[PDB]
Design a protein around this motif. Sequence first.
Motif, PDB file in Angstrom:
ATOM      1  N   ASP A  10      10.726  -5.031   4.819  1.00 33.62           N
ATOM      2  CA  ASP A  10      10.035  -3.809   4.390  1.00 33.62           C
ATOM      3  C   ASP A  10       9.213  -4.024   3.129  1.00 33.62           C
ATOM      4  O   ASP A  10       8.104  -3.529   3.043  1.00 33.62           O
ATOM      5  N   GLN A  11       9.778  -4.755   2.169  1.00 29.87           N
ATOM      6  CA  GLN A  11       9.248  -4.845   0.820  1.00 29.87           C
ATOM      7  C   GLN A  11       9.101  -6.336   0.442  1.00 29.87           C
ATOM      8  O   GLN A  11       8.373  -7.060   1.131  1.00 29.87           O
ATOM      9  N   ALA A  25      12.689  -2.760  -4.113  1.00 27.87           N
ATOM     10  CA  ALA A  25      12.491  -2.292  -5.478  1.00 27.87           C
ATOM     11  C   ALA A  25      13.680  -1.467  -5.937  1.00 27.87           C
ATOM     12  O   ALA A  25      14.450  -0.973  -5.120  1.00 27.87           O
ATOM     13  N   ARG A  26      13.796  -1.281  -7.244  1.00 24.50           N
ATOM     14  CA  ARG A  26      14.817  -0.415  -7.817  1.00 24.50           C
ATOM     15  C   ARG A  26      14.782   0.994  -7.170  1.00 24.50           C
ATOM     16  O   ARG A  26      13.696   1.555  -6.894  1.00 24.50           O
ATOM     17  N   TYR A  28      16.136   1.424  -4.157  1.00 26.24           N
ATOM     18  CA  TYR A  28      16.350   1.173  -2.727  1.00 26.24           C
ATOM     19  C   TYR A  28      17.549   0.215  -2.589  1.00 26.24           C
ATOM     20  O   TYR A  28      17.900  -0.457  -3.540  1.00 26.24           O
ATOM     21  N   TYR A  43      13.755  10.946  -4.366  1.00 26.25           N
ATOM     22  CA  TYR A  43      12.415  10.586  -4.862  1.00 26.25           C
ATOM     23  C   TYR A  43      12.354   9.103  -5.192  1.00 26.25           C
ATOM     24  O   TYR A  43      12.236   8.732  -6.368  1.00 26.25           O
ATOM     25  N   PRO A  44      12.439   8.248  -4.153  1.00 27.48           N
ATOM     26  CA  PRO A  44      12.351   6.801  -4.375  1.00 27.48           C
ATOM     27  C   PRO A  44      10.924   6.410  -4.794  1.00 27.48           C
ATOM     28  O   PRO A  44       9.965   7.138  -4.508  1.00 27.48           O
ATOM     29  N   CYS A  45      10.794   5.294  -5.503  1.00 26.66           N
ATOM     30  CA  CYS A  45       9.493   4.880  -6.023  1.00 26.66           C
ATOM     31  C   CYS A  45       8.560   4.603  -4.865  1.00 26.66           C
ATOM     32  O   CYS A  45       8.981   4.227  -3.744  1.00 26.66           O
ATOM     33  N   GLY A  46       7.288   4.861  -5.092  1.00 27.39           N
ATOM     34  CA  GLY A  46       6.275   4.543  -4.111  1.00 27.39           C
ATOM     35  C   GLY A  46       6.176   5.421  -2.881  1.00 27.39           C
ATOM     36  O   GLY A  46       5.387   5.101  -1.995  1.00 27.39           O
ATOM     37  N   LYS A  47       6.932   6.514  -2.808  1.00 32.68           N
ATOM     38  CA  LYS A  47       6.824   7.436  -1.661  1.00 32.68           C
ATOM     39  C   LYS A  47       6.162   8.714  -2.056  1.00 32.68           C
ATOM     40  O   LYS A  47       6.571   9.395  -3.007  1.00 32.68           O
ATOM     41  N   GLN A  48       5.161   9.064  -1.276  1.00 37.80           N
ATOM     42  CA  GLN A  48       4.534  10.377  -1.399  1.00 37.80           C
ATOM     43  C   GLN A  48       5.622  11.417  -1.156  1.00 37.80           C
ATOM     44  O   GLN A  48       6.549  11.157  -0.372  1.00 37.80           O
ATOM     45  N   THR A  49       5.535  12.544  -1.854  1.00 40.77           N
ATOM     46  CA  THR A  49       6.559  13.562  -1.793  1.00 40.77           C
ATOM     47  C   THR A  49       6.250  14.645  -0.760  1.00 40.77           C
ATOM     48  O   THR A  49       5.134  15.190  -0.703  1.00 40.77           O
ATOM     49  N   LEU A  50       7.277  14.989   0.006  1.00 38.68           N
ATOM     50  CA  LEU A  50       7.191  15.990   1.065  1.00 38.68           C
ATOM     51  C   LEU A  50       7.883  17.308   0.745  1.00 38.68           C
ATOM     52  O   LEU A  50       7.483  18.346   1.303  1.00 38.68           O
ATOM     53  N   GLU A  51       8.894  17.309  -0.133  1.00 36.89           N
ATOM     54  CA  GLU A  51       9.491  18.594  -0.618  1.00 36.89           C
ATOM     55  C   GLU A  51       9.821  18.548  -2.112  1.00 36.89           C
ATOM     56  O   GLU A  51       9.846  17.455  -2.707  1.00 36.89           O
TER      57      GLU A  51
END
Lengths: 51, 231
Positions: A10-11, A25-26, A28, A43-51
């Motif tokens: 994945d990374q 990454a930190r 995960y 709210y993991p790093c690098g993810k666009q937020t959905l809620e």
Amino acid sequence: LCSLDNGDCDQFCHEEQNSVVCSCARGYTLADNGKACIPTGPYPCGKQTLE
Amino acid sequence: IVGGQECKDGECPWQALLINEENEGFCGGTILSEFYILTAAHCLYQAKRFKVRVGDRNTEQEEGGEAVHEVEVVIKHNRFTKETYDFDIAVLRLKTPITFRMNVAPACLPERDWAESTLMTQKTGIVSGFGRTHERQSTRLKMLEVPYVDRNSCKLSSSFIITQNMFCAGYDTKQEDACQGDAGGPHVTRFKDTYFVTGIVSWGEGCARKGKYGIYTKVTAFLKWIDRSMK
RNA sequence: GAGAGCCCCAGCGAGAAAACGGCCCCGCC
Ligand SMILES: [Ca+2]
Ligand SMILES: [Mg+2]
Ligand code: NA
């Protein structure tokens, strides 16, 4: 190895003992399959937020 | 941002905005964690004193999920040079921790070797900010996809020295680029739906000019220094 | 690469109207 589709990781991908080693990454956790990265919180790093 | 598109809800949650005494934005930043923001060193010379806004999309209306954090310490790279903008990087530690929520979330720091082989080699990165829409500050957060430009073309294109702490991204003649007010903000690179910090908006010879590119602080050169500054 | 000389040091130390060299990151025989 890592140059073949990022070693299926994945990374982060790196090579050691002639084998792919995936990492994350930190905030995960590496999945049981040794390849996918799993968010430890909402709210993991690098993810666009959905809620 | 010249050209590009608005950041839609949740699309640029790592964007920070540096705001002066008059609550006016003058530079961006990248959220790295609950306590830490990445920005450009030269942004520290733009205001007498400042704070950091997170969760903003539309500056014209203070309406909901915004929050303002005071800065506890400034960690500017000791080697920053005003004449060239070499080493154009700083980290801010905030007095109070950011609550991650809709529109507020960190961008990922990659490992250096993997960033070099796998991110810097992608076709494009994403830059964002509240900066000017042509070379006239945007009230809305914008984003733009910028192709990576190879170092030889970058140097040949530029009238000012491009150091190894810099890289080019953007377009030759197409009217899309970062601009004034975007400095210090995020350049991120997407890999399998995860966005990693790859640059800091630094400088340009104008904005979107023919034969010129956007110049970015090359984060790979600073990943070890960023870790120092965050431990 | 490695020593060394200087430069830098808005972070950890120490000090003296809150950009004012012991150590981490970093620059130029
Ligand atoms: Ca607003
Ligand atoms: Mg001092
Ligand atoms: Na251009």
